[PDB]
Amino acid sequence: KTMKKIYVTMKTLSPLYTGEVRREDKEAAQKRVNFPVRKTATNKVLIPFKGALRSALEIMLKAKGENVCDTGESRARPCGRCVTCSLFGSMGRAGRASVDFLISNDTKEQIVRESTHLRIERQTKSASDTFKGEEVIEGATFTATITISNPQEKDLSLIQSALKFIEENGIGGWLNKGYGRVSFEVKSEDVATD
Amino acid sequence: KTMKKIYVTMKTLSPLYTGEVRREDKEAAQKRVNFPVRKTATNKVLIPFKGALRSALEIMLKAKGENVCDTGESRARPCGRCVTCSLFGSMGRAGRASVDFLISNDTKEQIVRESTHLRIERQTKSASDTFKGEEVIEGATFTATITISNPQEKDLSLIQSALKFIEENGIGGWLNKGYGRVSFEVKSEDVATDRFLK
Amino acid sequence: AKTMKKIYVTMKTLSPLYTGEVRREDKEAAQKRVNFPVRKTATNKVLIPFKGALRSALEIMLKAKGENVCDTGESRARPCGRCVTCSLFGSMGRAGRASVDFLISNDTKEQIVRESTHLRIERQTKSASDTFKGEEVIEGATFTATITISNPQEKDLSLIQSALKFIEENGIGGWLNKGYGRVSFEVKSEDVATDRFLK
Amino acid sequence: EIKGILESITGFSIPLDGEYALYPAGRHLRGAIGYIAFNLDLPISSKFLDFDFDDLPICGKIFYPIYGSSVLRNIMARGLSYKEVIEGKKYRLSIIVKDEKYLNEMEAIIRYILSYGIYLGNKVSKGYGKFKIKEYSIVDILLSDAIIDEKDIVFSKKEISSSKFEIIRKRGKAK
Amino acid sequence: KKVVLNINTDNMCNFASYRLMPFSGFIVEKRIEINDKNWFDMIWNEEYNKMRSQHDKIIENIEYLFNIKILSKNRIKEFWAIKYITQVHRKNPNTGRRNWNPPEGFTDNEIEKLYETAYNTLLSLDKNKVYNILINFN
Amino acid sequence: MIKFFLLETAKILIDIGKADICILTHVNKIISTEIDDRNTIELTKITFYNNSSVFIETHNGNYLFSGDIGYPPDMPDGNVDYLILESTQDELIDYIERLKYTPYKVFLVHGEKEQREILAKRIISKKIRVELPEKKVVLNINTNMCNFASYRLMPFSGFIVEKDDRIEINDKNWFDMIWNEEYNKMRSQIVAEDFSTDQALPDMSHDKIIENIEYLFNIKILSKNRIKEFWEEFCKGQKAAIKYITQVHRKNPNTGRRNWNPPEGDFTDNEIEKLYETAYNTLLSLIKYDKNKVYNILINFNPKL
Amino acid sequence: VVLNINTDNMCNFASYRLMPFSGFIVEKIEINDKNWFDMIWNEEYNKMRSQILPDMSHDKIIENIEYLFNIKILSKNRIKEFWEEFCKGQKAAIKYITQVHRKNPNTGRRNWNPPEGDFTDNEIEKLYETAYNTLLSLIKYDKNKVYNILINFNP
Ligand SMILES: [Zn+2]
Ligand SMILES: [Zn+2]
Ligand SMILES: [Zn+2]
């Protein structure tokens, strides 16, 4: 058979935030910044890339008119039959898409910066609270490769449409405040035995 | 099944100042200017836009008499039942209006100039303090895209009214000194979410 | 509150008017032609700082009257936050209610701004020791601003009008000692509702 | 026999009993190499289906049963809570080849790893457990957990194309 | 006294029949090398961190404090000591603000009184006795 | 516009993707002779004319694709703006000349170089312009001209810069300006002995340093930003802290001011100068101690640093 | 690879001898500075078009600049403008200093700031020529030393 390999290179046009999950490094960072960026031991930054793709395809496929799940919504366990359950996986069956974490091509000492955020009263118009959160600069190029096993004809188009939905909505956190408006360059390849 | 994409172009009628957020960039700039502007690493100007719209709508809806909460006082939580709570987000429910940053079309050498600002003694009329601050020129244009998911009927009206409030008050910093008086132009477009699914 | 005060201020210039250019690139681009450029917009109009002139005027008159008004003109001085000017223009704790605009002119630079020549006459010998060319704004030029008070009190229009008469008395900006900046003001205020734009 | 160095690009998590494994075992290596054989449709993937076919952190010397648990970090997701090892570390690869029939197939598997990579641990489709090869070749060939008739050893055989998970729980010696 | 180049030779441009690329970096000497600004970010931070290397009434009080969300699971989790309560109670003299969560729904002197009540309650609080009552607040 | 034929406004193809193809002689829909000649269709009013021609009346521009011409042809009697003509010679001339409202620009296509050049020269001598075919917008920011070999020419060597929306053309003044800016940024990154060997100071006790620092923290001379920058300049060595406190305490001879924050109080000038030199001597005695001792000194006033 | 820059002004950050250095990596693999570029650029700027100083010691310069700064002949404004004219090349700084020093035959004035202090006219002319010779010798040095001289006076 054949396998699909999709290389995504990611250029952020807006700043990007993704909160750090490691409790040890969070409490090591919560004495200097209150919202640390998700980082590595290699001092790189990775973004969760899978649930953004799955959510993009799920909203688009639900609103166009087919049968898909909701997922990530309390006890919305996957059905195992829909297009998203084939592509990105289900509970009983296994995923056909192995979507990597979006590793940045640069280190944290050149694209990740501490930044100031505020909360300002509406009658006095003065800064009531502040907090330090890290963020990823604009133009920082992230790199991932996703791997699709047993592809259909509507596989590259679906991943492309979900990627364009990510360029609209955003990736990471603080999406409503403007963080994460990024762009994707895509390169596709089909590999076989030998 | 529907979104409301609003394309906002904003032109500065007054010189515009917003403040640099990044600490490293700021101490790189504090050797030349005491007040740098918020800039990208793509050398473009950055303006926060969600808080200005939310503050405008909260002030106007509190003045009208609707039961809209104040997310501006210290560590106050959104209640989750107001029009602004549904539009820009509560603690439980996320924000329906995904407000983009106000990205300038030009870069820093075109529209950002450093400036001399003074403090003058009231008697003796002499320049007592001096400081340099970067500011954005008049006539510079900025672009934002507000995406409203599950759009109600009044969302365009409330967003346009908030933009008129930002026209009358200002955006950014130094608002009492005359900075940041702008003018907005709105091109709304009703959008099906499945447009990318070709 | 539910009401806001809008004071539309119209300036007619009676003497020559100068306010020096503050942008370093524009000033350095103008020093090859004039030694004193006018503070000018990128849309070729003229802007004047207005909040500091009103605050300086009100602080001088209220200090003369005997009120407990701070001097924020001293070197790195902090406003206390209890003065009337602290309530109007601002303090370090809370922002001011009055939102004063720049005085943008109603005409473009080629119509109101002229390039003039000043000298330094030596006391004996009556000769031109030094000679410098500076830009100025002509008489009869009209400027406009909007002072926006968010929480109006009863003494906000009166103090703004008194500060405007003081600015008429002493001059708005630049070379006030040589006779520049003597201007006149028309005031048309209106208390507008805060929820006006919602409809 | 294949000596090699596996450098972790992304962190990995293997639950145990909620204890975790500081280093991946050869069990996950065998399972992932079997997925490499199956997805590229090599015949030796059938040999990966049976339990027996009979064919470590890295000082260049590999460690022996100080690494320690300090490598483990607690991670809280959207609602999930687990722990993982950090990346950026060189690990040992020793694929012992005992037959000449499947040596070329194993070398082809290793070449596919050298082109793209190999996934070891939980949440493979989420990107966890990336392992890049750094060095490899071919050489001439207690310390790990050994089964002898004890400590609980749990290994699993999720057969693909049958949709069956069964987690074998046996007893064995301690390294 | 040799010369090694640690700058990327990628993005090579052509001018005056000449291969060239304008760069802005640091000349380092111990060999003489040309390291990019990144080598200088690794060094500065490196050394900067190196420099860095050298029963009823009180239970009723948490029962009332939990309903108004001044004492959230975000508090008792960090509780589970006197320096931390003093840091949380520390009113900054320049802005007049404690690190406590504000109550929901109250005059200013009342909110100051419940801040003092929360301080007195968590100051009054064996480790097993600390492990009880807080388990019912999660 | 037409790309070499795809003519957007849509993306209608005349004889690629998302198109309404119209084949010639001599996608989503294929339009050919169904509609015969003399009949109009909509999609942009499209009308076909017999050759022995596609006529698209759009909102801006009325485009005519001719096709191969062999015999009197058939031409529209309306208004033509662009005339796409094949060239592979007098037959094309009158086909152009006998058409009312002669087009703005004609296009030559499907031929070699010599025949297209000869026909192009024949059409410039008829006073109709030609185009001879073989994306970020580009901006000349330049400013002298020449007339060599009947081309208006300028000898210029420069730089091309590529942003996300445009590509600009700049001269050496822009490169000099950005080089001076980057040289100023590079030289403001280092001081000669940062983070180096530890380097003529007054000495004072620890309790007096506590008393003086507390007294200049109550009144606003030694503040949190002052302690923050003092600790940051102390981290990069002893001489850096010496230079920082000499820069802060420096009285300008032209204005008579120092970089200390003025005290909050009713002190007279001599007492304010005594407090300024008290701050200078107190921090000079503070640079003597070890780093952990100074950290224990300054954590009680600035908890961040 | 051969560096074509002399490694002076060389700061001491720990055990890492250091220089901030801007330049071009020519792969002819030579590393030249901006000066080679200007001599390159004017090269094409005369080629394509065709196809269609006194000596002063470094101690004497800093002593003279200190003396003229004390009597305000060499102001901060003057040192800054000389620095911007020196950054544009040696010839532009030569022309600027010649313009500043030039005695106008009509007015009899020079563009230097007059000295602060009781001086006789001959000594004032000597101070003007001292400023001319000192800055004319400052054009001769390379940029990194001419900033390290002028950083002490106009930060
Ligand atoms: Zn499903
Ligand atoms: Zn609410
Ligand atoms: Zn006050």
Coordinates of N, CA and C in Angstrom, one line a residue, chain F residues 165-296:
Chain F
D165 N 3.3 42.1 1.6 CA 2.3 42.7 0.7 C 2.9 43.4 -0.5
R166 N 4.2 43.7 -0.5 CA 4.8 44.5 -1.6 C 6.2 44.3 -1.6
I167 N 6.8 44.6 -2.8 CA 8.3 44.5 -3.0 C 8.7 45.9 -3.4
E168 N 9.6 46.5 -2.6 CA 10.1 47.8 -2.9 C 11.5 47.9 -3.5
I169 N 11.8 48.9 -4.2 CA 13.1 49.2 -4.8 C 13.8 50.3 -4.1
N170 N 14.9 50.1 -3.4 CA 15.5 51.1 -2.6 C 17.0 51.3 -3.1
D171 N 17.5 52.5 -2.8 CA 18.9 52.9 -3.1 C 19.8 52.8 -1.9
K172 N 21.0 53.3 -2.0 CA 22.0 53.2 -0.9 C 21.7 54.0 0.3
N173 N 20.8 55.0 0.3 CA 20.5 55.8 1.4 C 19.7 55.0 2.4
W174 N 18.8 54.1 2.0 CA 18.0 53.2 2.8 C 18.9 52.2 3.5
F175 N 19.9 51.7 2.7 CA 20.8 50.7 3.3 C 21.8 51.3 4.3
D176 N 22.2 52.5 4.0 CA 23.0 53.3 5.0 C 22.2 53.5 6.3
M177 N 21.0 53.9 6.1 CA 20.1 54.2 7.3 C 19.9 52.9 8.2
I178 N 19.6 51.8 7.5 CA 19.4 50.6 8.3 C 20.7 50.0 8.8
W179 N 21.8 50.3 8.1 CA 23.1 49.8 8.6 C 23.5 50.6 9.9
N180 N 23.3 52.0 9.9 CA 23.6 52.8 11.0 C 22.7 52.4 12.2
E181 N 21.4 52.1 11.9 CA 20.5 51.6 13.0 C 20.9 50.3 13.6
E182 N 21.4 49.4 12.7 CA 21.8 48.1 13.3 C 23.1 48.1 13.9
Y183 N 24.0 49.1 13.5 CA 25.3 49.3 14.2 C 25.0 49.9 15.5
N184 N 24.1 50.8 15.6 CA 23.7 51.4 16.9 C 23.1 50.3 17.8
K185 N 22.3 49.4 17.3 CA 21.7 48.3 18.1 C 22.8 47.3 18.5
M186 N 23.8 47.0 17.7 CA 24.8 46.1 18.0 C 25.8 46.6 19.0
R187 N 26.1 47.9 18.9 CA 27.1 48.5 19.9 C 26.4 48.8 21.2
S188 N 25.1 48.9 21.3 CA 24.4 49.1 22.5 C 24.0 47.7 23.2
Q189 N 24.6 46.6 22.7 CA 24.3 45.3 23.3 C 25.4 44.9 24.3
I190 N 26.6 45.5 24.3 CA 27.7 45.1 25.1 C 28.2 46.3 25.9
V191 N 28.7 46.1 27.1 CA 29.6 47.0 27.8 C 30.9 46.2 28.0
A192 N 32.0 46.8 28.2 CA 33.3 46.2 28.0 C 33.6 45.1 29.0
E193 N 33.1 45.2 30.2 CA 33.4 44.2 31.3 C 32.1 43.8 32.0
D194 N 31.1 43.4 31.2 CA 29.9 42.7 31.7 C 30.2 41.3 32.0
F195 N 29.7 40.8 33.2 CA 29.7 39.4 33.6 C 31.1 38.8 33.6
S196 N 32.0 39.5 34.3 CA 33.5 39.2 34.2 C 34.0 39.2 35.6
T197 N 35.4 39.4 35.7 CA 36.1 39.4 36.9 C 35.7 40.5 37.8
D198 N 35.6 40.3 39.1 CA 35.0 41.2 40.1 C 36.1 42.3 40.3
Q199 N 35.7 43.6 40.0 CA 36.6 44.7 40.3 C 36.6 45.1 41.8
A200 N 38.2 50.8 45.9 CA 38.1 52.2 45.7 C 36.7 52.7 46.0
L201 N 36.1 52.1 47.1 CA 34.7 52.3 47.5 C 34.6 52.6 48.9
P202 N 33.6 53.5 49.3 CA 33.3 53.7 50.7 C 32.7 52.4 51.3
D203 N 33.0 52.2 52.6 CA 32.5 51.1 53.3 C 31.5 51.5 54.5
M204 N 30.5 50.7 54.7 CA 29.5 51.1 55.7 C 28.9 49.8 56.1
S205 N 28.3 49.8 57.4 CA 27.8 48.6 58.0 C 26.5 48.1 57.4
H206 N 26.1 46.9 57.7 CA 24.9 46.3 57.2 C 23.6 46.9 57.8
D207 N 23.7 47.3 59.0 CA 22.5 47.9 59.7 C 22.3 49.3 59.2
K208 N 23.4 50.0 58.9 CA 23.2 51.4 58.4 C 22.7 51.3 56.9
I209 N 23.1 50.3 56.2 CA 22.6 50.1 54.8 C 21.1 49.8 54.9
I210 N 20.7 49.0 55.8 CA 19.3 48.7 56.0 C 18.5 50.0 56.4
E211 N 19.0 50.8 57.3 CA 18.4 52.0 57.7 C 18.3 53.0 56.5
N212 N 19.3 53.2 55.8 CA 19.4 54.2 54.7 C 18.5 53.7 53.5
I213 N 18.5 52.4 53.2 CA 17.7 51.9 52.1 C 16.2 51.9 52.5
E214 N 15.9 51.6 53.7 CA 14.5 51.8 54.2 C 14.0 53.2 54.2
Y215 N 14.9 54.1 54.6 CA 14.5 55.5 54.6 C 14.4 56.1 53.2
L216 N 15.2 55.7 52.2 CA 15.0 56.1 50.8 C 14.1 55.2 50.0
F217 N 13.5 54.2 50.7 CA 12.4 53.5 50.1 C 11.0 54.0 50.6
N218 N 11.0 54.6 51.8 CA 9.7 55.2 52.2 C 9.5 56.5 51.4
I219 N 10.3 57.5 51.4 CA 10.3 58.5 50.4 C 10.8 58.0 49.1
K220 N 10.4 58.6 48.0 CA 10.5 57.9 46.7 C 11.8 58.4 46.0
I221 N 12.9 57.9 46.5 CA 14.2 58.1 45.9 C 14.7 56.7 45.4
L222 N 14.9 55.8 46.3 CA 15.2 54.4 45.9 C 13.8 53.6 45.8
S223 N 13.5 53.3 44.6 CA 12.2 52.7 44.3 C 12.4 51.3 43.7
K224 N 11.3 50.7 43.3 CA 11.3 49.3 42.9 C 12.0 49.1 41.5
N225 N 11.8 50.1 40.6 CA 12.5 50.0 39.4 C 14.0 50.4 39.6
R226 N 14.3 51.3 40.6 CA 15.7 51.6 40.9 C 16.4 50.4 41.4
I227 N 15.8 49.7 42.3 CA 16.4 48.4 42.9 C 16.5 47.3 41.8
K228 N 15.5 47.3 40.9 CA 15.5 46.3 39.8 C 16.7 46.6 38.8
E229 N 16.8 47.8 38.4 CA 18.0 48.1 37.5 C 19.3 48.0 38.2
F230 N 19.3 48.3 39.5 CA 20.5 48.2 40.3 C 20.9 46.7 40.4
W231 N 20.0 45.8 40.7 CA 20.3 44.4 40.7 C 20.7 43.8 39.4
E232 N 20.0 44.3 38.3 CA 20.4 43.9 36.9 C 21.8 44.4 36.6
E233 N 22.2 45.6 36.9 CA 23.5 46.1 36.7 C 24.6 45.4 37.6
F234 N 24.1 45.0 38.8 CA 25.0 44.3 39.7 C 25.3 42.8 39.2
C235 N 24.3 42.2 38.5 CA 24.5 40.9 38.0 C 25.6 40.9 36.9
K236 N 25.7 41.9 36.1 CA 26.7 42.0 35.1 C 28.1 42.5 35.6
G237 N 28.3 42.4 36.9 CA 29.6 42.8 37.4 C 29.6 43.9 38.3
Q238 N 30.8 44.3 38.8 CA 31.0 45.3 39.8 C 31.2 46.7 39.1
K239 N 32.0 46.7 38.0 CA 32.2 47.9 37.3 C 31.0 48.4 36.6
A240 N 30.1 47.5 36.1 CA 28.8 47.9 35.6 C 27.9 48.6 36.6
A241 N 27.9 48.1 37.8 CA 27.1 48.8 38.9 C 27.8 50.1 39.2
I242 N 29.1 50.2 39.2 CA 29.8 51.5 39.3 C 29.4 52.5 38.3
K243 N 29.4 52.1 37.0 CA 29.0 52.9 35.9 C 27.5 53.3 36.0
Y244 N 26.7 52.4 36.4 CA 25.2 52.7 36.5 C 25.0 53.7 37.7
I245 N 25.6 53.6 38.8 CA 25.4 54.5 39.9 C 26.0 55.8 39.6
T246 N 27.1 55.9 38.9 CA 27.7 57.1 38.5 C 26.9 57.8 37.4
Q247 N 26.2 57.1 36.6 CA 25.3 57.7 35.6 C 24.0 58.2 36.3
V248 N 23.5 57.5 37.3 CA 22.3 58.0 38.0 C 22.6 59.2 38.9
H249 N 23.7 59.2 39.6 CA 24.1 60.3 40.5 C 24.7 61.5 39.8
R250 N 24.9 61.4 38.5 CA 25.5 62.5 37.7 C 24.7 63.7 37.6
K251 N 25.2 64.8 38.2 CA 24.5 66.1 38.1 C 24.9 66.7 36.8
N252 N 23.9 67.0 35.9 CA 24.2 67.7 34.6 C 24.7 69.1 34.9
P253 N 25.8 69.6 34.3 CA 26.2 70.9 34.5 C 25.4 72.0 33.8
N254 N 24.5 71.6 32.8 CA 23.7 72.6 32.2 C 22.4 72.8 32.9
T255 N 21.8 71.7 33.5 CA 20.5 71.8 34.1 C 20.5 71.7 35.7
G256 N 21.6 71.1 36.2 CA 21.6 70.8 37.7 C 20.6 69.8 38.2
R257 N 20.4 68.7 37.4 CA 19.5 67.7 37.9 C 20.2 66.3 37.8
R258 N 19.8 65.4 38.6 CA 20.3 64.0 38.6 C 19.1 63.1 38.3
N259 N 19.5 61.8 38.0 CA 18.5 60.9 37.6 C 17.8 60.1 38.7
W260 N 18.1 60.5 40.0 CA 17.3 60.0 41.1 C 15.8 60.6 41.0
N261 N 14.9 59.8 41.4 CA 13.5 60.2 41.6 C 13.5 61.2 42.8
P262 N 12.8 62.3 42.7 CA 12.8 63.3 43.8 C 12.1 62.8 45.0
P263 N 12.5 63.2 46.2 CA 11.8 62.7 47.4 C 10.4 63.3 47.6
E264 N 9.5 62.4 48.1 CA 8.2 62.8 48.5 C 8.2 63.4 49.9
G265 N 8.1 64.7 50.0 CA 8.2 65.3 51.3 C 8.4 66.8 51.2
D266 N 8.8 67.5 52.3 CA 8.9 68.9 52.4 C 10.4 69.3 52.6
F267 N 11.3 68.6 52.0 CA 12.7 68.8 52.2 C 13.2 70.0 51.4
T268 N 14.1 70.8 51.9 CA 14.8 71.8 51.2 C 16.0 71.3 50.5
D269 N 16.5 72.1 49.6 CA 17.5 71.8 48.5 C 18.8 71.1 49.1
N270 N 19.3 71.6 50.2 CA 20.5 71.0 50.8 C 20.2 69.6 51.4
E271 N 19.0 69.5 52.0 CA 18.6 68.2 52.5 C 18.4 67.2 51.3
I272 N 17.8 67.6 50.2 CA 17.6 66.8 49.1 C 18.9 66.3 48.5
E273 N 19.9 67.2 48.4 CA 21.3 66.8 48.0 C 21.9 65.9 49.0
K274 N 21.7 66.1 50.3 CA 22.2 65.1 51.3 C 21.6 63.7 51.1
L275 N 20.3 63.7 50.8 CA 19.6 62.4 50.5 C 20.2 61.8 49.2
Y276 N 20.5 62.6 48.2 CA 21.0 62.0 47.0 C 22.4 61.4 47.2
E277 N 23.3 62.1 47.9 CA 24.6 61.6 48.2 C 24.5 60.4 49.2
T278 N 23.5 60.4 50.1 CA 23.2 59.3 51.0 C 22.9 58.1 50.2
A279 N 22.0 58.2 49.1 CA 21.7 57.1 48.3 C 22.9 56.6 47.5
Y280 N 23.8 57.5 47.0 CA 25.0 57.2 46.3 C 26.0 56.4 47.2
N281 N 26.2 56.9 48.4 CA 27.1 56.2 49.3 C 26.6 54.9 49.8
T282 N 25.2 54.8 50.1 CA 24.6 53.6 50.5 C 24.7 52.5 49.5
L283 N 24.4 52.9 48.2 CA 24.5 51.8 47.2 C 25.9 51.5 46.8
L284 N 26.9 52.5 47.0 CA 28.3 52.2 46.8 C 28.8 51.2 47.9
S285 N 28.3 51.4 49.1 CA 28.6 50.4 50.2 C 28.0 49.1 49.9
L286 N 26.8 49.1 49.2 CA 26.1 47.8 48.9 C 26.8 47.0 47.8
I287 N 27.5 47.7 46.9 CA 28.3 46.9 45.9 C 29.4 46.1 46.5
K288 N 29.9 46.4 47.7 CA 31.0 45.7 48.3 C 30.7 44.3 48.7
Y289 N 29.4 44.0 49.1 CA 29.1 42.7 49.7 C 29.0 41.6 48.6
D290 N 28.8 40.4 49.0 CA 28.6 39.3 48.1 C 27.2 39.3 47.6
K291 N 27.0 38.5 46.5 CA 25.7 38.6 45.7 C 24.5 38.1 46.5
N292 N 24.7 37.0 47.3 CA 23.7 36.5 48.1 C 23.3 37.5 49.2
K293 N 24.3 38.2 49.8 CA 24.0 39.2 50.8 C 23.3 40.3 50.3
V294 N 23.6 40.8 49.1 CA 22.9 41.9 48.4 C 21.5 41.5 48.0
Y295 N 21.3 40.2 47.6 CA 20.0 39.7 47.3 C 19.1 39.6 48.6
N296 N 19.7 39.2 49.7 CA 19.0 39.3 51.0 C 18.7 40.7 51.5

